[PDB]
Every structure is written in C-alpha cells, then in structure tokens.
Design a protein around this ligand. Structure first.
Ligand SMILES: *[C@@H]1O[C@H](CO)[C@@H](O[C@@H]2O[C@H](CO)[C@@H](O)[C@H](O)[C@H]2NC(C)=O)[C@H](O)[C@H]1NC(C)=O
Ligand SMILES: *[C@@H]1O[C@H](CO)[C@@H](O[C@@H]2O[C@H](CO)[C@@H](O)[C@H](O)[C@H]2NC(C)=O)[C@H](O)[C@H]1NC(C)=O
Ligand SMILES: *[C@@H]1O[C@H](CO)[C@@H](O[C@@H]2O[C@H](CO)[C@@H](O)[C@H](O)[C@H]2NC(C)=O)[C@H](O)[C@H]1NC(C)=O
Ligand SMILES: C[C@@H](NCCCc1cccc(C(F)(F)F)c1)c1cccc2ccccc12
Ligand SMILES: C[C@@H](NCCCc1cccc(C(F)(F)F)c1)c1cccc2ccccc12
Ligand SMILES: N[C@@H](Cc1c[nH]c2ccccc12)C(=O)O
Ligand SMILES: N[C@@H](Cc1c[nH]c2ccccc12)C(=O)O
Ligand SMILES: *[C@@H]1O[C@H](CO)[C@@H](O)[C@H](O)[C@H]1NC(C)=O
Ligand SMILES: *[C@@H]1O[C@H](CO)[C@@H](O)[C@H](O)[C@H]1NC(C)=O
Ligand SMILES: *[C@@H]1O[C@H](CO)[C@@H](O)[C@H](O)[C@H]1NC(C)=O
Ligand SMILES: *[C@@H]1O[C@H](CO)[C@@H](O)[C@H](O)[C@H]1NC(C)=O
Ligand SMILES: *[C@@H]1O[C@H](CO)[C@@H](O)[C@H](O)[C@H]1NC(C)=O
Ligand SMILES: [Ca+2]
Ligand SMILES: [Ca+2]
Ligand SMILES: [Ca+2]
Ligand SMILES: [Ca+2]
Lengths: 801, 799
C-alpha cells in the first residue's frame, strides 16, 4: 500500500496530498553490512500540520456546501514527505498504483496537491506526467517547472522567482550600493534564482565579490571555508536564496563566531522562518529586509484549528504525534502520561501563533481550483464541450486527463472577489510585500513590519516603493550603511585603475597643470580653451593674464613725466632764443637751424611717447620710423653747422631726411609691421607685442643713422681745438659719444629680455640720447645769455669771433 | 510487459540496460481531446546501436569464459530511451516490478547499465535508489551525481566535468585571450559546467562578453535572439557545453546566415558528433578545438559487429529496424522489398565506420565491473566477508544491495593491464585528448587530428600540453587569432577607464611632462626623482644640465688669459720702477706709495679669477670684499697724492681701508652669502648662483666706494692745469671717469641677466676698470724712462 502514517477518508472522488510534517531525515550513512531499513524523520513541523489542516478544512467546506457539487463527496489520501525525495516517491507510487495495472485495491487518484520543495516537486512531476494526472503546488516557485515539454501536467498557485530576483536588484540599485556578495542553496530553488539575480545585477553596474553554495548536509570544513570567505570581504550587503533548514548551520557558526554589521537580503522562503528568526540570533540577523506573499482570509479556520483531538480525529493519523509533541507527554493506547483534556491555547507554537495566512491560502485556493474544474465538468451542456465535436465528459466516469483539460481552461472568482486564471505555463502572478525584522519591547521576539511593496503590474522602473523612515538598520540604527568598494573621488581628482580588480574599485589621481575637473568621479581630466589656464585646486580654470607696458602705472607715469619735462625744457630754450634773437651770440649761430633743431628734439620726445601703451596695428607701423626721421633731422642740423649758401644749409637736412623717408615707405608698403599675441613664452600668461615683419629694413634704418653719426664724429674730431663759438666742436663730439655709448650699452637687454621691459629700455635710451644732445648743444650758450652775463659777453666776445 | 521493442535473453542473473536508439521523439502538440497515446521516436542512432551491441558482446564473452562465474549464466533486458525522461521511466518501472511486489513471473534485476544524458540518469537514479539497485553509467558526467546523500547507488565509469571546465580556462590562458563568450545547454549537463568555467575564468582574469542558453526544442524567436547576441559581439572565442541534438538548430541558423571567423571550443559531448561535423558546415565550424576520451581495444568486436542479421538475431528486436534504416527497404513479416542477402560493408554509416572506441569501451568496462563483483561474491571465504560477522553472501540467493556493497569495494585489472577502482563518490579519473577539426583532401569529410593532451595526475599549471604547429585555426590558417577587447598601450602611454565596460576594455592616454612610463601595459605613469626630467617620448628619463661659467669653456680661458696678461704688465711696471728706484722720475712722487698702488692693482686683477668657476660657499662669500678692499686701497693711494693732500699719508690710506674692512666684517657675522642650486626658474636646467644675503650692506659697500671716488674727482678737477709730474692731475680725472663710465654703462645688462653671463659681466667690468687705472698713471712715466734713459729726469718740472 504505502506509508502507515497518513490521513485518509473515503468518497466518490479522491484527492492526493503531500506535506512536510518533519524537517528532515536522520543522518545515517549506512555501511550496507545488513539489509537496509527505512529511514526516520526528526523534527516536527507545526506549520506543515497547519497547511494539512487547511486542505482538510477546504475539502470539508466543499462537501458541506450544496451549491458546488450536489450529491457527490470528496475523499483524500495525504502523506508526509519530510522534505526528502525518497519519501515522496514512495507515496507517489501508491497514487499511480491502480493506473499501472493496465499499463504494466486502491481507488484511483484524480489530482494531487503538490509539494513544497522544487526538487521534490520535479521528482514527483516526472512520474505524475506519465499518467497525465494533474498536480497543483502551493509553494514550488522554481523557473525550471515552467517548461511544458518535460512537465505536462504541472500547475501552481504561487509566482515564480524571476520577478523577485529583479526586485532584489531594484532594491540594491535604489539604495545605491555596488559591492555585494551572494549565497545560494545547492538545489533547484537557489541556483536558478541566484543566476537570474547575477544576470540582472550585471546590467545595473553592480560588482559581486563572492558567491558560495550551502546545504543542509554540509560539513564543518565547508562551513568554516564559507565563513572565512565571508570574513575576508569588505562587502556589507549579502543576498541569500535559501530556506531555513538549508541556512541554519551557517547562521549557527556565524553566531558562535560573533560576526556583526552585515546587511541581509532575504528571499521569501526564509524571510519568515522560525528556525532563523530566534531572539538569541538578533545581534547577527537583526534588521533583515525580505519578501512576503499576499495574505488572504479564511473565516472559520481558526475555530476549526482549535478543535483537533488525538481521539476524535479518526481520519487524521498525525494528530497523535502532534499532541505528544505539543504537550511533551506519551499516549497510552488501550515523559509523563497524556490525559487528553489539555488545552491547546496553553502552549505557544507556530500552530495557532500566526498573524497572516499566506501559504495556507494557497492550499485553500488549489483545492477550490480542483473543485471548480470538477463543477465545470458537471455543468456541461451537450454540443458545447471542450472535447471533439463539442462533446461533454461523464461525471460518473471522469478521468484525470479530462480534469487536466478543464484545469487548463479554468476561470473563476474566489471568496475575496478576485479572478483566478492559469496562463499557458500554468502560472499565477501576484504582488510582493517587503518586511523588516524588528525587536519587540513587550516580549523580546522578532516582529515583521511592512516597509514597502513590489507592484508586478506596473511599467518597468515603477515597480518598487519603499518607506525608508520605518527601517531600522541592524535593528537599532537610523543611518543607511555604506557598501561601496572605494570612496568617490572629489572635484579636481580623477579615477585610476587597479590591476586585477573589478571596475568598482579604483584610485583617486590628481589632474595635471593644464586640465581640471568639475564634478565627482571623472574618468578623465578636461582641457579648457586656449585663453584660459587651470585653477590651483583644478576645480575650474581661470582666464589668462595680459601683460604690456600700460598707463596708470608707477613706471609709465614716471616715463611720461620725464618726456613732458624734456618737451617743456626744449620749449623754454626755444622761447629764450625767440626773445634774444636780435642779440649777438644768437646770431653767430645760424638763427633758423636752431629752431629746426628744437623742432626735431620736440619730435623726439613725442616719438618716445609712442612706445608706452597697449600695442595696436597703427602704432607698430609708426613707432620706430618716428624716432629715425627726427634723429636723422637732428644729426643733419648739427652736421651742417660743423667745421669744414643759406639755401644750401637747408638742402642737406632735407636730402638726408628724404632718403630716410624713402626707405621707410618702401618697407611699410611691402612688409608692414603688425601686432602679434604671444603665447609660446609661458603657458600661464600672454604678451601683446609688435612684429616687425622685416629685420632688413630695421637694420638699414639703424645703419643709416649710425653712418651719419659717424661722419659727424670724424669731421668734428678733426677740428676740436678751435675756440670758436665757445668750443662748439668739443661739445658736438661729446654729444655724439653719448649716442654711441648708450645704444651699445643697451644691446644686451634687447638680446635677452622678452616681456614688458623691452619697451622700457627703448624709452630710456631715447630720452637719454635726446637729453645728452640737447644739453650739450644748448645749455652753455643759454646760461651766459641770461642769468649772470647780462651784458658781460652778450656782445663783444661773440662780435669779435 | 513494458515497451514492445526490446532485446531480451534469459539466464540465472539478469542485467538491465538503457540506450538511445533514437535521437528524440515526435513534436506532437497534444491538446487533450482524446485519451493520450504513446509518443513516437523519429531519428535513428547507429552509434547508440553499436553501444548496445557492445554490452551483448561483453555478456556473451563472459558466458563463454570458464574462469569467470563458473556454472552461471547471465541474461539481459534492454530498452530504448530516445533521449527522453518519460520513455526511460516506463522501462525503469519494469526493472523494479518484482521488488515493489515484495515491498508491498517477473524476473529480478540486480544491476542496470546507466543512461547517457545526465538529466535522464538523475531521474532513473531517483527511482533505482529506493530499492538499492546499483546503476553503472557510461556517459553521464554531471557533478550533481556525485552527491551521495541523494544518489545512494549510482556509479559511473566516466570522469566528471570539473577537470574539463578547468582545462578550457587553461587553454584560453595558454593562448592569451581575455574576451570570450559562452553558450550552454539548458539541462543538468551544460549549466554546472558553464558555472564552473565562469568561476575559473574569473579567477584567471578573463572577461566574458555574453552568456546564452539553448535547447533542442527552442522556437525561432529564441534562436534569432541568440544569433543577434552573437553577431553584435567583438569576441571571437566561444565556449560551448552542449550536445549535438541541442546544438543543431543554432548551427543550422548560423550556417544560413553564413557567419565566419569564429573560434569554437568544444566539450566532449559534441566534439565528435556527426550531426555537427558535416562537410556543408565547414566554412562555419572548421578548425574546432575540443576534447576526447582515452581509447581502448576490444580484440574481437568488429567481427561480431559484422555478423548482425534481421532473421538470425532472435534475441535482438532492434535489428529489424536497423536493417530497414541501413538499406532503405522493407521487410515482410513505396519502399522496395528487403532480402537477407545484403552486405553491410556497402553502406557507410557510423555503425562500422569509426577509428577509436571510447564510449563502447566504457560500456564494456561497466559490464565487466558487475561481473567481477559477482565473482568476488562467489569466491568469498567464511570469516573473511564484508558483512556483519564476517559472513559471506550466497550466490544462489544474491541481492542487489549485496552486489552494491561488493561494488563499493572493487579493485581488478582489465585487458590492458590497468587497475579499475571506484572512489568514495563512485567516480573514475582519466586523461583527456585534444583534437582539431581538419578537412580530408581525398574524401571531403572531416578528420579529427590529435594535437595535445591533458594530464590529470600532474600538478596545477603543468597539466596541459599543446603541439601548436599541428593546428589550423579556421581549417586553412597558421596564425593565432586576436581575441582581446582593446589594443595594447605603447611605451609612453598608460591606461584609462571607459565607464560602463569591464576592465579588459580601456583607452591609452599619454603621460604628461615630467613623468614617464616604460613597460608595455602601464596603468600609472611614474615620476622619476628630482634632478631628472622626462624625454621627448616620455619613455625613459634623462639627467638635466648644470649651467655655470666653466674653466674649460673657451670663454673662461680667454678671461684667464686677460687676467694673466694684466698681472704680467703690472710686474714689468713694478720691475722697471724697482730698477730705477732712486732716479729722478721715480723720486718725483713717493715710491713708497707707488709700490702699494702696483700691489693693489695685482690684488684687483686676481679678484676676477675668483669669479670664474663653479660657485662654492667660501668663494661666494669672498668675491665682493676681495675687489672692494683692493679698489678702495687704490683710490686712497691716488687721493693722498693729489693737489694739497695735506707718515700722515700712510695713515690716511690705511684709515680709509679700515672703514670698508669693518663694514665687511659686520656683514659676514650677521648675513653671509651662500651658494644655491636654483630649480624655480626653469624645468630642464639647474642654475648654480649666489644669494647675496643682505642687500643693504652691499649697498653700503658700493655707496662708500662711490663717495671715495667722487671726492678724489672733485679735488683733482679743481687742479687740472698744473704741469707737474707730466700732467698728473690730467690723468687722475680720466681714471675716475673711466671707472664711473664703465659701471654706469654696465648697469643695464647686470639687471637683465640672471643666468651664467652675470659673472662674465662683472669680470669684464673689473678688468676694464683695473686696466684703465693702470694705464692712466703709469704709461706716460714709462714712456720716457724706458727710452730717453735720463732725458726728462733732470728737469721734469725741475725735479
Ligand atoms: C556608491 O556607488 C554608486 C555607483 O557608482 C554611486 O551611485 C551613483 O551616484 C551618483 C551621484 O549620486 C549618480 O550620478 C550615479 O548615477 C550613481 N550610479 C548609479 C549606478 O546609480 C553612489 O553614489 C556611491 N555611494 C557612495 C557613498 O560613494
Ligand atoms: C596520462 O598522460 C600522461 C602524460 O602523457 C602520462 O604520463 C606519461 O606516460 C608516459 C608513458 O608511460 C611516460 O613516458 C611519460 O614520462 C609520462 N609523463 C609525461 C609528462 O608524459 C600518464 O601515464 C597518462 N595516464 C594514464 C592513466 O594513461
Ligand atoms: C591580450 O591580453 C592579455 C592579457 O591582458 C595579454 O597577455 C599578456 O601578455 C604579455 C606579453 O605577452 C605578458 O607579459 C603578460 O603576462 C600577459 N598577461 C596575462 C594575464 O597572461 C596578451 O598579450 C594580449 N594580446 C594582445 C595581442 O594584445
Ligand atoms: C628706437 C630704436 N629701435 C631699436 C630697435 C632694436 C632692434 C630690435 C629688433 C631687431 C633689431 C635688429 F635685429 F634689426 F638689429 C633691432 C631705433 C629705431 C630706429 C632707428 C634707430 C637708430 C639708432 C638707434 C635706435 C634706433
Ligand atoms: C664687484 C662689484 N659688485 C657689484 C655688484 C652690484 C653692481 C653691479 C653693477 C653696477 C653697480 C653700480 F655701478 F651701481 F655700483 C653695482 C663691487 C663690489 C664691491 C664694491 C664695489 C664698488 C663699486 C663697484 C662695484 C663693487
Ligand atoms: N519556494 C520554495 C518553498 C517555500 C516557499 N515558502 C516557504 C516557506 C517555508 C518553507 C519553504 C517554502 C522552494 O521552491 O523551495
Ligand atoms: N556526458 C554527457 C553525454 C555524452 C557524453 N559523450 C557523448 C557522446 C555522444 C552523445 C552524448 C554524449 C551528458 O552527461 O549529458
Ligand atoms: C582569508 O584570509 C586569510 C588570512 O589573510 C588567508 O590566509 C586565507 O587564504 C583567506 N581564506 C579565504 C577562504 O578567503
Ligand atoms: C475570466 O472571467 C472574467 C469574468 O467576466 C473575464 O472578465 C475575464 O476576461 C476572464 N479571463 C479570461 C482569461 O478569459
Ligand atoms: C498590486 O499592487 C497594486 C498597487 O499596490 C494594486 O493596484 C494591484 O491591484 C495589486 N495587485 C493585486 C493582484 O492585488
Ligand atoms: C544588436 O545590435 C542592434 C543594433 O544596435 C540592436 O538593435 C539589437 O538589439 C542588438 N541585439 C541584441 C540582442 O541586443
Ligand atoms: C588494487 O590492487 C592492487 C594489486 O593488484 C594494489 O596494488 C592496489 O593498491 C589496489 N588499489 C587499491 C585502491 O587498493
Ligand atoms: Ca456538496
Ligand atoms: Ca583577479
Ligand atoms: Ca562463466
Ligand atoms: Ca558593460
């Protein structure tokens, strides 16, 4: 037949069931020295007993209601799996026992309410699909069961895990973490979920540090290896796809070693597990964020639950062990002795200490789905069926494949006003709820508080809602933890690569002296336009600096004062000779060449005033010829009076000025000078300077000036001794000598300096030469004429010679 | 009862077997409108038929042998799986029929020769483990079957895929690639293998572009998506963990789109598959590199194979369909009519057209393992058994759990002289061979050429051997392909991050100025230490130059020659004055003062030699006073012999020197100058110069000298017209003018140059001033004393 411990009742139509009443089997590596025996189950499961009671309650309600299946009863045959494949397959062999008589007594089974674990469900479905017996599961959520090529008669009332993996990725992206590790159970439930999560997290630019597998039957060395892998890591957020039985040993080891500060993200299987939500583990598993399914209502279920008895439950064979485990007594069929009149409310167990019904509602829904398919078969009308020619099935000889067909074409409304339909893959979609683990002040137990939800019917990117103010991190903290591999670079600083490490870990390197950085996390430094240079902090770049000899400057003001003083002195000398024209010393110097020379000296100082200021196109063209013309005129006026025909004395000056003017015009027409902004000298600053355009013409001008100064020198030199005109040759020689020594002296500075000081030396040299010429030629004569010798030599000495 | 078509023979002990005689089942979309019927298998598998024949040959050889299991016979019951779970479970229910009757005319099965696919073997083992019936598989290599908490009676004669997944990464690292993609079958064989490969590749710093899943029953849309993923990638190497049936549709679609240039890494399941190794597909799948198992020898297998007959094989129910498929005719119990007189050497099929036996040898060994376990049960001695009190099992009433117990403790030698034994998880270990797909020049078919091996008994990093000169990369090329995400940086450039991409993809950025890099693939430019600056190419860094006025430089030699010439000239004027000491011209002035003046001229000239050369602290501190003191001594000597200066003469000169000396001493105690190596002015040049410490004191040492010179000027200027000592006061004013003119004219250049030329300017100024001071006074006296030996001495202003 099958297992001796069961819950069964007779009826017209029989339903099968598989529930975990125990958490596992005994650890016994049999050595095969004798014939093997049956294995034993260990730890009782009050939640599984409640789920079984939910199935029985639904069946009894259906049998009581006259509106769903009149004059037809339902039976059941329910077994225990102990979360093990081997035990489940023994019970499945009894389900198909009658059907195998024809293919290769127990009444035939129509449908089976599925298992809990995905591996157990796959093992059961492989065998149930041979005979086309429908199977409806309440807890299996693996994506591997959606393949209808291998599983032909599998349905479920629970959604699959792809949406939940995407939800975890969305949560991690919401809190702005990029450095996590993963842990998964080594079975059909954890591995596909963790693979989907990895695929989703890779496209959101999240780096995963470690990934490990665990099991209920792992050994101490494996546990310690996983613990060391966890301990050596800097990541704080850990994502776990597992259940309580598969997770308990690792949690126990971590608690013993006292590892704190971790952030756990829990899947639906262990997010509400009483094996892990223990008060003494809170310093490790406090403040967990996990997922929960949607709750439903079953009105009289609790009153039904409070009625179980070891003696009155004849059809329930698990009630005896339930009573013994609940009250820690022994039942003497005719540790203290059970008396049988105890109170269930006295002992606190997960049997009735619950707030929401989630998987129990799924069991209820699966039973009602099977009942509604049978009712749809019952109420068929001839000619309008789902079979060939519109024929209807026979309710007195209904078969499992016909029940499966009507299950595939099913649509009904539940007790809450919602529609229930199965898709082409036999899946049912639903929302998710997000919970946080708190600590109770009144009792000291774990309290699950809602903090958000995940809406599956919304557009991508608007599925997650979280109320952050209700979250206590690690159970007590109000601050969002930091889970990034490295700190973000700041303004002025740039990212660097570390060899052998993922893209999420980098080094902050400073930007160079020509580039800057505005925001955080720059992968390169930006070069800014050519008229700007980078700031010291390198946050931005400031404008460059323009440098030229300018007015409103202490140096330029002094130069201007010197120039105007020279102009005024020349004007005063001219006025002196104007006043004293008739008198004799003024006449023994050609009267009008003196005026021309003073005019040329005024032209000289004004020429110096050209160089001060910001260079422009129209000044670089005139500044240099202006000094040349005037100084050649000065030299000519001096040379015509030299010791060696009135209109002839006005011919030489015009001729020399004529050659000078002619050279400048040729040069300017063919290659005029122009302004030239200079940036190559320094990166930081810019110079505004004139560009000559032709050095040949400048050399020719300087050569002509030097040649004229030379001929004067040689001729003034040959006749210095003469005492005429107060030793005029002696002073002319001095004036020429001042010229040559000054210009030769300034050559080096022209050769070396490059900035705003090259313009200053030119003004200094011009003023020096002009003053040296004017003073030497004029001041001795102007002295006697006024001041003391009012008449001492004002006539006779001049008159005599 | 059970499946209709089978191979069956009765005996004392019955074995079970499962083989894929068909590649799959018909794609019937069942809508439930009738009582569902059995599905039908479609494509024939000659390789699977040969595998089935190997088991029968082994059993017949065992039955013929008289030294193994004497006076006992072996039977068998063999079914077909068609590579599906559902068909395999129908046969497995017949294997456990009698035991379940005992649990709750059927012969008992003690052992089953396992299936081919890992997914099928898992489902078969889940049911066979309930009754403790041992199962020995020949082809299932998933690592999930090593878990003995779930699979209590599973054994295999093939190694698992951990070493293969490691060897894939070993080969990839050997050929220096870091940009690959992965493809796996969606079952129990491909997913764990691709997971292990991903772990190892991430361990070896290898970047994976994409990862896709395929299946035999994938629709058009999934294949289109996979092809689109493949065709958008720049990766050229693809790792595949799948079989031929699950890989055929994708290969067909890629062939139709005719995508060339890819490098395929094949797992053992499809590395020798005839569904993929077709001459039409060669332009896409040419040059594939894959794995193979080690071949064995069965010394009578081919003659047994060549003897099959549809009418002489009574115990083989597959031979009729084998004959029909082979000869394309019909057997009587519009295809033509078969006879029994065809020759199987005419039609070329994988049945007898093979080179090596790899899985057939595994089947042979799987049968012989059970045979030797039974023999070990047979020859047990009382008190030396494996059971509770040392007892022995009974061969007449043997049981499957006892056979499993003896299987767990098996150790025997096979026909190749090798030892066979199963470890704690019921696994074997074995070598791998590496093959390369070539094209036959004569037949046009595909030839599998061996190019290496993988030794699993060696140490990590010494297990792979590749003979690279035997590899054709696309079937026609001898150059290793390039499969890196980005090109490698050059000598002067470093890496740079590309956001949104893995570490294997980067950009090259040039090193800045003052930094360099030298390795091939740098991630950070290096700042080489101070006193060094980068090259133009930023590849190596060179030493920068030290700039100072050097003795060996010809400018310094010329200045030294000038100084030496001045020193000598002073020596002749002193020697001449020494010769004519008491003569009238030398007696005219005070010779006691002329010697001091000539001695200070040498002191001045030598001060210039203190400027030339590499600066040091003491020379720098000694430069200025050495000239100042000597020149003030000269000036005082001249002054005290001008008109009406009034020994007191010696007093005045020394007193004036003592003032400049004290200013000098007050300077050195409070603010001495020192040497400096200047880095701020330029980048590639280092300047050695002097800071002058306190500039104010130097101001005093210049103003005092200028005032002393100026006073001498005025008083000489007053008396410029007395014809005494050959117009002495005419020449003193000239010397003062020369000194002032030289220093005034040298102002500009001193304040324009802060390089190595400033010292040259100072040297030139000192030399010019000293030469002027010499020639102003002494040249005229010498003029008429070198010649005119005594002409003017008698009455020079009346001597
Ligand atoms: C941790 O790393 C993440 C990922 O780089 C950072 O999130 C980025 O934050 C900036 C500014 O807030 C955004 O412009 C980016 O779009 C974010 N990236 C992503 C992928 O969302 C986060 O700021 C980092 N946190 C800390 C504390 O460094
Ligand atoms: C697996 O392959 C290795 C490498 O070929 C084998 O070791 C070699 O065996 C040959 C034959 O005896 C020796 O000549 C070599 O010296 C061995 N070492 C090497 C590095 O080649 C090994 O025997 C093979 N294992 C099995 C079981 O065949
Ligand atoms: C492709 O990339 C790999 C790894 O980035 C390069 O392998 C390196 O090659 C250099 C020179 O041959 C060796 O010094 C390194 O040790 C190698 N690194 C590793 C991890 O093996 C390879 O050279 C690149 N190939 C091309 C063509 O650029
Ligand atoms: C005002 C002055 N200009 C000097 C330019 C120096 C220069 C700057 C750049 C290049 C060159 C050179 F390479 F051409 F020499 C020289 C000047 C102007 C006109 C006549 C002059 C005659 C005598 C003295 C000065 C004269
Ligand atoms: C060797 C010389 N050192 C002068 C440096 C400053 C300077 C450089 C160029 C020009 C001028 C000056 F003409 F303005 F002084 C000063 C020195 C040392 C000690 C005493 C001196 C007395 C007179 C002259 C030079 C003296
Ligand atoms: N979905 C889980 C089973 C499961 C869901 N909720 C649970 C609650 C408790 C225990 C198990 C479960 C699986 O496939 O394996
Ligand atoms: N070992 C493979 C099957 C296999 C190995 N070699 C083969 C050769 C041909 C066909 C299939 C195979 C698996 O577990 O699935
Ligand atoms: C953890 O760290 C220790 C000490 O640093 C190191 O020796 C060890 O290899 C690491 N182990 C794991 C499993 O990461
Ligand atoms: C199920 O029935 C409701 C009730 O009218 C209907 O609105 C809904 O479309 C039905 N669903 C399907 C899939 O037919
Ligand atoms: C899921 O949640 C959204 C918003 O919270 C709600 O509108 C929707 O009706 C929910 N879905 C179901 C099936 O209750
Ligand atoms: C391949 O590239 C094209 C062009 O960018 C794009 O439209 C397509 O979506 C890509 N394929 C996939 C699978 O992303
Ligand atoms: C198997 O037997 C041989 C003797 O033939 C022995 O050398 C070898 O060690 C044995 N193997 C094991 C694993 O005991
Ligand atoms: Ca009813
Ligand atoms: Ca690494
Ligand atoms: Ca025999
Ligand atoms: Ca990317």
């Amino acid at each position: 037949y099958g297992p001796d411990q069961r819950a069964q009742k007779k009826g017209d139509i029989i339903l099968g069931g598989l529930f975990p009443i125990h958490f596992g089997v005994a650890a016994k590596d049999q050595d095969l020295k004798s014939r093997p025996e049956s294995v034993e189950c260990i730890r009782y499961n009050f939640r599984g007993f409640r789920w079984l009671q939910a199935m029985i309650f639904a069946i009894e309600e259906i049998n009581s209601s006259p509106a769903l299946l009149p004059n037809l009863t339902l039976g059941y045959r329910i077994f225990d799996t102990c979360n093990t494949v081997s035990k489940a397959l023994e019970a499945t062999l009894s389900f198909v026992a009658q059907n195998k008589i024809d293919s290769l007594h127990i009444p035939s089974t129509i449908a089976v309410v599925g298992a809990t674990g995905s591996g157990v469900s796959t093992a059961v479905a492989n065998l149930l699909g041979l005979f086309y017996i429908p199977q409806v599961s309440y807890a299996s959520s693996s994506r591997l069961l959606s393949n209808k090529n291998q599983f032909k008669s599998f349905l479920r009332t629970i959604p699959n895990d792809e949406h939940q993996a995407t939800a975890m990725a969305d949560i991690i992206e919401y809190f702005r973490w990029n450095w996590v590790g993963t842990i998964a159970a080594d079975d059909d439930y954890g591995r596909p979920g963790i693979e989907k999560f990895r695929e989703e997290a890779e496209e959101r630019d999240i780096c995963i540090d470690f990934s490990e597998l665990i099991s209920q039957y792992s050994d101490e060395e494996e546990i310690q290896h996983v613990v060391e892998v966890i301990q050596n890591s800097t990541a704080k957020v850990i994502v776990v796809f597992s259940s309580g039985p598969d997770l308990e040993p690792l949690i126990k080891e971590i608690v013993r070693r006292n590892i704190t500060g971790k952030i756990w993200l829990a899947s639906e299987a262990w997010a509400s597990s009483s094996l892990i939500a223990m008060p003494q583990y809170f310093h490790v598993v406090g403040g967990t964020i996990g997922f929960a399914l949607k709750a439903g209502q079953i009105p009289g279920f609790r009153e039904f639950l409070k009625k179980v008895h070891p003696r009155k439950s004849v059809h329930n064979g698990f009630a005896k062990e339930f009573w013994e485990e609940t009250f820690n007594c022994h039942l003497q069929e005719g540790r203290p002795l059970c008396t049988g009149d105890e109170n269930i409310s006295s002992v606190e167990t997960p049997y009735i200490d619950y707030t929401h019904l989630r998987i129990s509602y799924n069991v209820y829904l699966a039973v009602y789905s099977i009942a509604h398919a049978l009712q749809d078969i019952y109420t068929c009308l001839p000619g309008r069926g789902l079979f060939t020619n519109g024929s209807c099935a026979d309710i007195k000889k209904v078969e499992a494949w016909q029940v499966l067909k009507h299950l595939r074409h099913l649509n009904f409304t539940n007790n809450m006003g919602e529609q229930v339909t199965f898709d082409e893959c036999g899946d049912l979609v639903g929302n998710y709820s997000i919970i946080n683990w708190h600590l109770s002040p009144e009792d000291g137990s774990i309290v699950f508080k809602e903090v958000g939800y995940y809406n599956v019917y919304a557009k991508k990117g608007e599925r997650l809602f979280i109320n952050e103010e209700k979250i206590l991190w690690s159970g007590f903290s109000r601050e969002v933890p930091f889970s990034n591999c490295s700190r973000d670079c700041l303004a002025g600083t740039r990212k660097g690569i570390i060899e052998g490490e993922p893209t999420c870990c980098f080094e902050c390197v400073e930007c160079p002296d020509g580039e800057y950085s505005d925001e955080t996390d720059a992968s390169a430094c930006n070069k800014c336009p050519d008229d700007f240079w980078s700031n010291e902090n390198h946050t931005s770049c400031i404008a460059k600096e323009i440098e030229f000899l300018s007015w409103t400057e202490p140096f330029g003001i002094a130069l201007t004062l010197f120039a105007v003083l020279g102009i005024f002195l020349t004007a005063f000398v001219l006025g002196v000779f104007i006043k004293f024209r008739n008198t004799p010393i003024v006449k023994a110097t050609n009267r009008e060449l003196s005026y021309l020379l003073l005019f040329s000296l005024l032209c000289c100082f004004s020429s110096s005033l050209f160089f001060i200021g910001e260079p422009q196109d129209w000044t670089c063209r005139l500044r240099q010829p202006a000094f040349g013309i005037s100084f050649v005129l000065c030299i000519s006026c001096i040379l015509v009076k030299t010791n060696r025909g009135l209109n002839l004395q006005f011919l030489l000056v015009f001729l020399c000025t004529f050659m000078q003017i002619v050279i400048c015009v040729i040069w300017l027409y063919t290659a005029p000078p122009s302004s030239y902004r200079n940036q190559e000298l320094e990166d930081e600053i810019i110079f505004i300077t004139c560009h000559e355009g032709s050095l040949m013409a400048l050399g020719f001008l300087i050569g002509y000036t030097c040649l004229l100064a030379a001929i004067c020198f040689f001729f003034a030199f040959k006749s210095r001794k003469l005492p005429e005109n107060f030793n005029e040759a002696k002073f002319i020689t001095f004036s020429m000598l001042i010229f040559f020594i000054v210009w030769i002296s300034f050559i080096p500075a022209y050769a070396s300096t490059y900035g705003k000081f090259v313009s200053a030396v030119e003004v200094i040299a011009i003023l020096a030469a002009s003053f040296g010429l004017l003073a030497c030629i004029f001041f001795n004569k102007i002295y006697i004429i006024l001041f003391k010798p009012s008449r001492n030599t004002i006539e006779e000495v001049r008159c005599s010679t």
